[PDB]
Design a protein around this ligand. Structure first.
Ligand SMILES: CC(=O)N[C@@H](Cc1ccc(C(C(=O)O)C(=O)O)c(C(=O)O)c1)C(=O)N[C@H]1CCCCN(Cc2ccc(-c3ccccc3)cc2)C1=O
Length: 106
């Protein structure tokens, strides 16, 4: 269960995820997974980033889940679970702003 994961914030809004991720103490890759605000069945991976150009900022990546069982950000790279997906992105930046590092503080 996703509801078991400490990085799963469930039904929080996009604005709220930005409020939590825009904390000065968050290093790049601080993240949380929440429900998509407008796509039934989808989730969103909200991630903190930082560069001199934009300072501290947030990126939101939609996560799709097929009834066929696969979870993914890009259909080319699928996982059997949301947990496996988070594990993979904690080791690979790929198309993300930074590899996932630590769960977002509230
Ligand atoms: C309004 C907004 O924040 N849009 C997000 C997408 C998005 C997320 C959540 C909701 C949203 C919510 O906020 O709840 C909702 O679902 O309703 C909505 C929305 O408003 O509809 C839309 C966006 O454009 N993110 C960027 C994020 C930065 C990269 C650029 N890109 C395209 C992309 C390219 C590559 C990859 C990639 C990643 C890993 C590996 C390989 C490739 C992923 C995305 C994105 O999707």
């Amino acid at each position: 269960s996703i509801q078991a994961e400490e990085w799963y914030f469930g039904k929080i809004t996009r604005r709220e995820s930005e409020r939590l991720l825009l904390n000065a103490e968050n290093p790049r890759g601080t993240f949380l997974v929440r429900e998509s605000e407008t796509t039934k069945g989808a989730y969103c991976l909200s991630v903190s980033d930082f560069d001199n150009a934009k300072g501290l900022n947030v990126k939101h990546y939609k996560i799709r889940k097929l009834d066929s069982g696969g979870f993914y950000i890009t259909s080319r790279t699928q996982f059997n679970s949301l947990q496996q997906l988070v594990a993979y992105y904690s080791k690979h930046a790929d198309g993300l702003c930074h590899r996932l590092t630590t769960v977002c503080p509230t």
